[model samples]
Each structure stands twice: as structure tokens, then as C-alpha cells.
Target: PISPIETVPVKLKPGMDGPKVKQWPLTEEKIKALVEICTEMEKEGKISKIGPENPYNTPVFAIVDFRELNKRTQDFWEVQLGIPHPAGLKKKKSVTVLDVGDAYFSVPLDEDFRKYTAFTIPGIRYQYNVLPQGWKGSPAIFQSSMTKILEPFKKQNPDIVIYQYMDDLYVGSDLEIGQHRTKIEELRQHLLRWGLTTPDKKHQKEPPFLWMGYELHPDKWTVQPIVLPEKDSWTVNDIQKLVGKLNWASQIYPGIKVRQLCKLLRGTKALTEVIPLTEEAELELAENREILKEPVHGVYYDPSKDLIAEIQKQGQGQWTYQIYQEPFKNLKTGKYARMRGAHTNDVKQLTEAVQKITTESIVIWGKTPKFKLPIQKETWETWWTEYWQATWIPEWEFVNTPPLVKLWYQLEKEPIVGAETFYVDGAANRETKLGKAGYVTNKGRQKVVPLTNTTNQKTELQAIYLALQDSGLEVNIVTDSQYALGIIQAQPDKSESELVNQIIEQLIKKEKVYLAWVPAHKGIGGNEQVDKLVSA
Candidate 1:
């Protein structure tokens, strides 16, 4: 005969004198028993079905709503057993006791009776039942248990604040410092009286600390503090170790320092071996070493002029001619010409040609000056045709267009238009009660609009479409998201693959929109502005 009973066995560590049982590996019989118990609990509506599993031969992992179970148990204990009310127990403050290793259970009652009628709650077995850290359902279960235990305290003391993520708790008060400490102590005592251990002293504290991976600083907006390992003067090995732990905060110092060290090492080796430090090589080495010692600071690169002059003095004998004079004449016109400066244009050209032919037997190609080649071509063409279509093309156009096409037309003749200056990002969280869409305009206006029943990808596409529509002008669109953009660019007939089809339909009709790709968060002008807005 079944009776209304709930029994939770407490495992005593070895050497303690209480009923003990040897731990055994879970076998077919044990698993079957667990399944049977779970099935019984489900029929009684004690637990819901584990997600949408098949009814037949479903795997059963035991999970109890400890808060509800505790509530029921406490009511029975208070009314039937007439025990002292577990002060904080009624308030659902959850304590998760993890089994470090195997745990055993035993009952002093008759084995046959225990098997047939006596009640026993199984110990936590995190096999298929529990998820690892960062799992979706873990937080919910953790929070539920914690809330059940802490609810009573919250109700009793409205000023006391208790926060928990899994087993970690953050208890505080906005009251006066002395009152806050008293309240924390009271909460601590309440937890202790109820058989739950408060957080370890090292982990529990006031402001400027981390609780359950979240930084708790004095500021309302919490931030993790810069934590560095204790070390003496930085050696090469120390620097390397520091490099391994480099984050955004430490990056600047280590980055510049390590680069300077590497530069010095490289220069020392290069000057001694490859360059074979002559007077000129020594001067170059000294100059480079100085640069390594005093790298460009912030936005300024002010080197010691006195030090440079001193180094120059040591290499005076090997210094190359500062000014070389040359004579020149037009051979066809037989005109006498005197070149007073460095070298005449003819002599400089001849020297370069000879050097190219003799040194490597290969001509060195150099990048053309900005606005020079295109402007010169436009000028020549205009001189010939009596009209210049374009000149002074911006540097942006040359890099963005194909070289062959760019060569044929100057900016004045055919200018590329509608370059996108914004990078868009969008995501949706079902957990957030309010639906929201956010965007940054070209002028850096950030606005978060309410959205309803829209997926993240669609929201992003809508942002792009709305941007074009709002501008009421033909524009190019750039996005880091291939998922969103792929939908927009997909062929119309096949585009109905998902919700992305709406964006595709809008784009395919040539609704004054062009799509392009930009690397995400790269600090490109427009993208950076948009990112700032989104973050804001």
C-alpha cells in the first residue's frame, strides 16, 4: 500500500557514525527504478515532461522543483511534526550542494519495506539530467531554487537584497554602512540556521568585487577590475607571460614595449651582420636604437635633437654629399644651362636608369602619387579635346573600383556614387520582455524603436530598408552579416527559403538600394559611428 511520504537521506562522510551504504555504479536495474519513479511523479504532475520527448521508451532524468517540494515538506513538518519553523527555509533561498564524487544512501528500515513502501529521494546525479556551465536551462533551475529559499527573507526584510547566480549569492543593503553589515549578518545567520552555508568569506564581500563572474564595482554600471599577477621587474620571460594574459587594458603598454624591444634586437642583429656597421651603418643603428628606446608617444614623435646631432657627428666622415651640382644643356637647341641645386633633372634620371640597370637588372616599380597620374591624363586629354570631364578624384574611388576601369576614366568623367558609410547590426532576445529595434543614422542619431514578433535577421534587414527609405535617395548598403545579406541578394524565386525572403523581395526590385560587405567592428569611419550608437 502507498502512503504520502517524503524522505531525503543525508550522506555522512567516512568515519562518521550513521547508517552508511557503499556506492555502486548505475546499472540497468537502477536506471529502470529511476525511470519508474520519474514516471510516477509525472503522472501525479509533480514534474512536467522533459521537453517534447516521445512518450514511449523516453529517457527519464530526475529533476524536482525543490522549492515546491520544500514548501510542501515544510508545511507538513510545521503542522504534523510540530517542528520549529526553518526561518529562511520558507523563503526560497536555494543552496546547490554538488556531489564532489560518488554519494551513497542507506535506510535502517527493512529492505523489503523500503523497496515497496518506504520513501527515498535520489541524490543529485548530473549525468543526462544537468547541463554544464553556460547551458540555457541551468540558470533557470538555479534561480528557481534560490528564489524559493530567499523569498521569505525578502518578504520579512524589504531592505535586505539577495542576488544569486546558481550557488553564488550577493547579499547587500542600501541602508547605512553599520545597518548594512547588521542586515548581512542577520541574513547570514538565517541561512546558517536553515542548514544552508552562506558564500565563502573570500568570495563574499562589499563593493568592487566579482560575484558569479559578474564584476561588482562601486559604480552602478559594474565592470571587472584589472587584475594582474604579482611580479618583479619585467624580464623577457615575464614579458612573454604577460603577453599571454594581454587584454584590452594591458595591451597598449605591452604592445609598445614588446615592439620596441623587438625593434632593438632586430636592428642590433641587422647592423652587425647584414649592414656590417661602417660609420654610416653605426649612425643608422644609433638612430634606430634611439627610436626603440623612445618610441612615438601618443600622437607625438619628439626625439632628442641633441642626441641625433651627437650621433651625426660620429659619422661625419662617412656622410654622403649633402648637395651635388650638375651642368645641363639642351642638345637639340644648343642652349647653355647651369643647374645650381642637388642634381639636374637629366643627371638624376640618368643616375636612376643606370642604377636600375646595373644593380639588379630590374626596374623598381613605385606607387603613383595621388591625383597625379589621373589628373595628368585628364589634363592631357582635355588639352587635346578642349574639355576635361573630371580631375582631382578622391583617393577612395581608386581603391574601390577595378584598376582597368579606373584607368580608362578620371573622376571628372565618370565618378563612382552611392558609397555606403554605415555598418548595421541587429539581434533579438526572447528573454527580454520588451521587443526593440535600434539603428544609428549617418549623422550619428541613435534610436531604439519598438518591434513586434520580428526575428533578429529580419530586424536587421528592416533597418537597412528603412535607412534607404528614410533617406529617400539611392544608397549603397554595407553589412557584416552574411546571413542577412545573403537573403537580400538571393534570387527571388529561390529566396523564399526563410523569413529573410521579405528583405530579398524588397532588394530584388531595385528599390534604390545596393548591398555590399564590410568587416564587422573594424573601426571604419561609418561602421565605427554605427557601432558606438548601437552600444549606446
Candidate 2:
């Protein structure tokens, strides 16, 4: 039997009853669905049939309009709705998520006040027999009632932990599998007696399960967003929805960048404003989608790990920093990876981020960028002093390190001798979107690889990355693209591209590898050979 919580009533403002409301037109299919829903609920007496009572009918097609009723309902501001933090479930050995059936309609309403909630469909008028949805008071009323029912159960079984967010309950424990199962079943039975049925289809058990649109695992967590499907064009509303998902995903994994989406949003003022999808935005969206694909685990915080704040000067009066934690298991690659990181240029925001760190961390500040005459010495020192104010970072000390710009310069200026060498180059056609990367060895051995959907800069990096993959220890690798070299050698403050990251990995594995830059069309034999090879 569906019983109501007598303490709560569907109360509304006095003298609020009035004429029918104008509602938007509905399609035949929607009209049929609404009719079927009303017929079934009336059959169960969950809603009562009434006459053509002017009954404040809101022409709210298909469903009742509870807007006026919601506005007039008593405020329950004290009854806050809060769910358990994802961090709370981090170390759980077992977890189960339960959803209550007919969660809102389960609350009973006072017969006298039902008329205040009356609404009209095409030709019929009705009032809720139970606490209806869309009424501002429904969530708080239902939440308070659900909490009341679970309190006694929690008291009786102190060992089984329960997190109730409205009708959805998350039962987790450090207990073993068999013991946890019994406790969950017990809670399920307890809820059933209170007329709250948890359907089997809605239940989630074990680790790495999804709860409240978040994919939670024993060791890590990530959000599950319904990525917008591919479209030829999008409205401001479509971009907004995509950005909304990205924002949630960023909350879990801050390393996920949405700068491009932010740029796209600035051009439109209204949600319905239509815009053609730009190739750059589409590429960015695809990259975000790839990060959310399966085999993904959110970077979680571990207090035991060492935190490092790396700061670099991008340009005059411009700086960026990234906060990184020690390496942890990357479930996707089955290898160790940093807990990812965050990047920002705002000095105060950067200071706030560091201050929020619960653990002592090292701040590695890169040396100031080199200039021909040091013209901005005073400006640079002023900013340096401003950053130095953060010296208040407790339990940590600043360490000066050579910047990648300086280091790369040193590597470029110095001459080196190595074992065998290979000249690599890539070519790309922006219009056709076809590209190729090829390498030539001194022994006249050469190979060419065709690529698709590539850029000139990406192909340049890919050429070097591919050559390094096939090379051995103590070899020399030369590339004509300084752009590719800077990305690898400088290690910019922003997240590195995938190909550049792979090249760095290769550099680390080799005993000794020399990277050198040369000008294109300089008539160098290996460069000329690889250029021709890729041109084919």
C-alpha cells in the first residue's frame, strides 16, 4: 500500500483558484501519452476526476501547470537537498545505488487543498490526490519523508552506511561482499515496507558503477555525460548543452580544457541563435569527447602523494602554472600517470589554488625568459616580487630551475656527435586534409608513411615521433620544423599534445639522443631525400 506522510500537506496560497490557463499546443503522440498517463493515474485514484471547474486550469498541455501553486506554496528553505560527495565513496569496498519507484506521488495530500493544485488537459480537469510534482514543495517534502523512514533503519544497523539524496539511496560499506549483500537486502526490505520499491533494473552493485551521473570506482571517479551527437550545424542552445557537459567533466578532471568552447559561447547572446560549426570548434569537441570515452578514470586526490607546483613565464607580464601530484595508476593504460593537473595564468587564482593544498608542496619557479637587452628588467622584477608574496606557502620552499626556453636554446647552440642519424620531415595539404611523414637514414634506407586528417605542424611532430619510435640508443634525430622542436624541447606550460608526449617518452627511453634543427630546402642530403620521399 502506498502510504502518505501525514505530517506534510500539499498546502498552497489562499484565494489562488481561478480560470483555465493557456498552454502550448501538443502533438498527437504527446496528447495520446498524456491521456494514457492521466487515465491510469485516475484509475488508481492517485488523481481525482473533476468537473469543468474553472479550477485555475493552466493550459499546460499534457501535464498540469503547478507554477502558480509552486509560487504560493510555503517555503521549506531549511530542508536543503544535498547528496554525498564523490570523495566520500573513495575507499569503499562495496557500494549499491537504489532508486525509489513513484517517489513523488507516494506522498499524500490533504483533500481540502487538492483543488488548489487542479490543472486542465484538452477538455478534462483534475486535481492531485497525492503530492504532485512541479509543486515547489515536493522535493523537500519527499526528501524529509524519505529521511525519516531511513533514520530508524540506520539507527538499528549502525554498521551499514546509508546516503540518502531524496528517494535515491547509496548504501556503501567497507564490509566484505557476502556481509554487504545481506545488509543491502535488509535495507531494500525495510524500504519496501515503507511503500518505497527499488526496482531491480535501477540497482547498481559493485565497484566502478555509475551513481547520479558519475562513474565511481574504488580508487578513482569520473563523470558520465551524455555527449551531444555529431551535427552539421548547432544553435547556441546546442553549444550551451555541450559546454554544460564539459563543465561537469572538468569538475572531475580539471585537466580537461574547455577554452575553445568558452570562445564559441562569446559570439552568441541568445540560446536559439544558430551558428555554423567551425572546424576548430569541432576538433576541440572531438578531443573532449575522446577524453570521456571508455577506459577513463578521473584523477583523484591522494594526501600521501607529494604535490608540485610548476610555474613558468610565458611572456612579458604573462605567466602560467600547473599543479601536479605524484604518479598514480592510470587504469586506461595500466601504467603510472600523474594525478593530472590544473593550469591558469591568474596570479591571485594561482595563489589561492596553492593555499588550498592540504599538503606541503614544492614550488618550482622557472628562470625569467631571456631577452636581448633585458629591457623589461624592472617590470619583470615587480611581477617577481608580487609572486614572491606567496612565500607564505607554509612548509614549502621555492626552488629556481632553468626554463625550457633557455634549456632548448642551450641544446640548439651546442654541437654533439652521435651514432647513426636520421632526417625526418612531413608534408600536409590543408585543403585535401591528407598528409605524410617520412624519414631517411644515411645508408640510403628510406620509408614514407601516409597520414589522414592531419595538420602541417602535427605532421612535422609525427615525423619525428615516428622516427624515434623506430630508432635505437645514442642516435641523432634531425627535423626541419622548429615548431615541433619547441613543443618537445620547451615543454610549454599547457598540456602537451599526444604526439609530443610520445616523443618525450621515446627521448627518455634512449640512452643518448641528440635533437638538432636545420633549415628546410638547405640542400642537406638527408633532408632533401626525406622531403622527396614524403612528396611521393
In model 2, what lDDT does residue 320 have?
43
* Candidate 2 structure quality by residue, lDDT tens digits, 166-228: 666778787888988888888888888877778887655456566656566777775555565
List of clashing residue pairs for candidate 2:
21-57, 21-59, 23-59
Q: Give candidate 2's error at residue 484 in angstroms.
A: 41
Residue 338 lDDT in model 1?
Answer: 27
lDDT of each: 0.35, 0.61
Candidate achieving the largest TM-score: 2
Off by over 4 Å in 1: 1-142, 203-206, 220-536
Q: Give the TM-score of candidate 1.
A: 0.23
Report residue 427 deviation for candidate 2 (angstroms): 55
CA deviation > 4 Å runs, candidate 2 = 7-20, 24-32, 60-85, 109-113, 202-206, 230-250, 253-296, 299-349, 355-536
Error of 2 at 515 (Å): 46
lDDT of 1 by residue, 16-127 (tens): 3221221233466775677676565445333323321221111222221121112222121111212111111111121222111110110011122121111122432211
